Design a protein around this ligand. Structure first.
Ligand code: FAZ
Length: 838
């Protein structure tokens, strides 16, 4: 192994944020085994991909152009403006024309083909045999009444993507020797015992406890715990979960390893402490802090492997229930007995597999037999909600999860991007490091630069702040980095250097000030100085914007930089675009913040993006504005600065605003004053109506509707939008001023208001057609992103919000009433936010 390669592993370690060659925290070889196992999948995808399309990563879709976008094209023509150094002729185009085709209606239309079309000021290319209406940039330009500006240039050299070459029927039992913790001191000396559970898909097959003993820094039971389950009956993927009750600490050990061998021998496991139901409780990793943590020693000495009319009605009823409906023992017995009928309803699959007795070898075998004749499933139309249901904490069986991944195989790149964060979060529910899901993400990321970019940041986000999963995600990220190509690698290196520098600055400045005071010139002077120093050497000529990889940021515009006045003291940075072909002088705004887990915001924003695509599948545009947000490290990251935007509170505050008085007409005035004409003003009011509806609906369903005015913004162009998603009542925010813009006051009516209620209802029922998708996303969001959330009651909110079980009439009713409540409450809740502080 050349000294060069060691230097390389060193480089990867600095991009990843973890050393995957570190063996300090392992009790076996699963991780190393996996690093090797992933070599094959990587090399296969790298060698399979087309160098040209890979270099230009065109962003395309197979979905049809929505109705609301055809409206802007009634002439069946689209104008593309090509530029190549001075003047620029604007080619008339047909929504069906191909990039190579408009190149024909050009050269000859003018009068050597080794050239390509690139969006101006972006690393974005319109290539491949795809209709121009199928390009995301084209649809983005239409939805925004913007012109499509392109530049003629030379295709990127695929050479630049070169990848470096690589080179017994007995019952199961376990002995609990004892537990050891360096220092126990809490308050009153209590007693302690160990609870050992055998689980599979978060289902306890068998449970045993030790006798209670006095809780001292070392407790020695030396006791055998014999379980009712036979060794032969242990399903692969089953965990021996060990817990300390006083619940203080937990830890897990996979009973059967990555080689199909029964675990055996002595183990001293460092446990995780509960912070006084969630994915962290399922980890096979042990606490990396060996110095201050509880440990438990154990010994293992135990290689393997026609329906009557009315009953059919019961079965179908069971199948129609929602993902969260509990399955009764009767239900499970039915689903199982009628196994073969059940297998004819893809939607029954999750309910059916939750009906399997996983602690019985014979039954599991019958199950694989069931999966053998999978014809109905394989030919079923892809249902993302259904596929995700089989990837959650409820299924630990490799094969069951594999058919889910099989269905994902059929997703187009545009959809993978929509679900990526949730798939990645779903890797936490995998019992082994090497899994079909992990390999699928690897594969899709290496196949496409955009998915790879995001995959990188999403993995890095978790590696930096999750002790429970950093090891696994690190192995996966490394596998990806070893295949993305030198170009991407150089880019990631730049992005990481930049954010690392800015992290230093952010922290230092937060120190030079109190917690809550204000922002003085001492602190601002210090900022501009520190930045001035970086601009010289430290901060690279350019770098890709992490939440918008097609955008290249150049030098900082130091005169415009500053520290924002908020509890936390985040930086307000602005950069020049490093692309001369850019169509404007507008800088690139980025907010840098330390002290908050931006992962929750990423999660919400991403679900918001999903809600948009769902509404798109229905021909609806609610004008949401899910700005870029990326967790880059522990409690720190970057956020996109939406241009020409203010807080609804700030609009209020600039006018008197003593103690938080509130006037209904302020908003309308602000909008009228920022509009150059009445035309632009009407457009602003309309957009406000649409965006208000979208955020009201989205926010009610996700159960985040009750927000303070300071957490909601609006663009000068009328787009309302929510922010700061980090962790008496009202369902959402629709205050009298919003109402005022709608032409109503004092519980009255109006054309825009009526239009609003219509949009809300259309939006709401449009989501109910996706009820399962939303429910499964909501619960995965809770399990992998929040603290220890009740696997029932917290999650049940969404079932109620989507009013599952009701017909259309009762739903509309429920929401309209919801709209009335905000009205009756007026300014009440908003007003309350100020007093709680006094
Ligand atoms: C002129 C103008 O005020 N521009 C401006 C200010 C703030 C934002 C913005 C534009 O757009 C990007 C969307 C956004 C999201 C934010 C957020 O999540 N949090 C949590 C937050 C809240 C307050 C302060 C800082 C932050 Cl990061 S802040 C913010």
């Amino acid at each position: 192994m050349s000294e060069e390669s060691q230097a390389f592993q060193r480089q990867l370690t600095a991009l990843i944020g973890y050393d995957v060659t570190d063996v300090s925290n392992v009790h076996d070889d699963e991780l190393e085994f996996t690093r090797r196992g992933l070599v094959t999948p990587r090399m296969a995808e790298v060698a399979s991909r087309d160098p040209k399309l890979y270099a230009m990563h065109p962003w395309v879709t197979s979905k049809p152009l929505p109705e609301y976008l055809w409206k802007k094209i009634a002439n069946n023509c689209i104008f593309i403006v090509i530029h190549r150094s001075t003047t620029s002729q604007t080619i008339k185009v047909s929504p069906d024309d191909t990039p190579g085709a408009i190149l024909q209606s050009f050269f000859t239309k003018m009068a050597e083909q080794d050239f390509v079309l690139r969006v101006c000021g972006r690393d974005e290319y319109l290539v491949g045999e795809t209709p121009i209406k199928n390009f995301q940039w084209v649809r983005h330009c239409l939805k925004n009444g913007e012109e499509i500006h392109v530049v003629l240039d030379t295709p990127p050299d695929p050479a630049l993507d070169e990848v470096r070459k690589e080179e017994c029927d007995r019952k199961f039992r376990v002995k609990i020797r004892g537990i050891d913790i360096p220092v126990l001191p809490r308050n009153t000396d209590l007693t302690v015992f160990v609870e050992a559970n055998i689980q599979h898909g978060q289902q306890v097959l068998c449970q045993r406890r030790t006798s209670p003993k006095p809780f001292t820094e070392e407790v020695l039971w030396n006791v055998w715990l014999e379980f009712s389950i036979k060794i032969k009956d242990l399903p692969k993927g089953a965990l021996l979960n060990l817990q300390i009750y006083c619940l203080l600490y937990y830890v897990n050990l996979l009973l059967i390893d990555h080689r199909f061998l029964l675990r055996r021998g002595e183990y001293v496991l460092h446990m995780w402490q509960i912070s006084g139901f969630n994915a962290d409780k399922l980890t096979s990793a042990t606490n990396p802090d060996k110095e201050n943590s509880m440990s438990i020693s154990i010994l293992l000495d135990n290689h393997p492997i026609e329906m009557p009319n009315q009953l059919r009605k019961q079965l179908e009823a069971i199948i129609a229930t929602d993902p969260l409906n509990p399955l009764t023992a009767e239900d499970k017995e039915l689903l199982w007995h009628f196994r073969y009928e059940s297998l004819k309803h893809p939607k029954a699959y999750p309910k059916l597999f939750s009906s399997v007795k996983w602690g019985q070898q014979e039954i599991v075998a019958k199950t694989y037999q069931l999966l053998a004749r999978r014809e109905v499933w394989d030919q079923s139309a892809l249902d993302v909600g259904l596929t995700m249901q089989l990837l959650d904490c409820n299924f630990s069986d490799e094969n069951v999860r594999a058919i889910a991944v099989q269905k994902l195989e059929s997703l187009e790149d545009d959809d993978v991007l929509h679900y990526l964060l949730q798939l990645v979060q779903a890797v936490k529910f995998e019992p082994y490091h090497d899994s079909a899901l992990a390999r699928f993400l690897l594969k899709r990321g290496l196949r496409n630069k955009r998915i790879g970019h995001f995959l990188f940041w999403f993995l890095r986000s978790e590696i930096a702040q999750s002790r429970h999963y950093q090891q696994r995600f690190a192995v996966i990220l490394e596998a990806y980095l070893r295949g993305c190509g030198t170009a991407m690698l150089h880019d990631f290196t730049q992005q990481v250097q930049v954010i690392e520098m800015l992290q230093k600055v952010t922290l230092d400045i937060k120190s030079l000030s109190a917690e809550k005071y204000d922002v003085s010139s001492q602190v601002i002077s210090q900022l501009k100085q520190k930045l001035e120093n970086l601009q010289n050497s430290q901060l690279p000529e350019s770098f890709r914007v992490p939440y918008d990889p097609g955008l290249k940021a150049g030098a900082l515009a130091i005169e415009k930089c500053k520290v924002m006045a908020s509890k936390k003291k985040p930086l307000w940075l602005e950069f020049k675009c490093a692309d001369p072909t850019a169509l404007s002088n507008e800088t690139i705004g980025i907010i840098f913040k330390h002290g908050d887990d931006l992962r929750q915001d990423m999660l919400i924003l991403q679900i918001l993006r999903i809600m948009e695509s769902i509404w798109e599948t229905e021909s609806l545009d609610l004008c949401l504005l899910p700005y870029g947000c990326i967790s880059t490290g522990d409690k720190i990251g970057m956020i996109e600065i939406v241009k020409d935007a203010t807080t609804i509170a700030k609009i209020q505050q600039s006018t008197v605003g003593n103690t938080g008085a509130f006037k209904d007409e302020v908003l309308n005035h602000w909008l009228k004053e920022k509009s150059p004409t009445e035309e632009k003003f009407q457009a602003a009011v309309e957009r406000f109506v649409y965006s208000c509806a979208g955020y009201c609906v989205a926010t009610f369903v996700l159960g985040i509707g009750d927000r303070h005015n300071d957490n909601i913004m609006i663009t000068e162009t009328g787009n309302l939008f929510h922010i700061d998603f980090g962790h008496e009542r009202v369902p959402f925010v629709l205050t009298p001023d919003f109402l005022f813009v709608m032409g109503t006051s004092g519980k009255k009516t109006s054309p825009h208001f009526q239009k609003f209620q219509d949009i809300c209802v259309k939006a709401y029922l449009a989501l109910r057609h996706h009820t399962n998708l939303l429910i499964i996303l909501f619960s995965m969001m809770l399990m992998t992103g929040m603290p220890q959330l009740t696997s029932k009651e917290d999650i049940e909110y969404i079932r109620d919000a989507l009013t599952v079980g009701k017909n259309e009439e009762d739903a509309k009713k429920y929401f309209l009433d919801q709209i009335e409540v905000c009205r009756d409450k007026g300014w009440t809740v908003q007003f309350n936010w100020f007093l709680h502080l006094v």
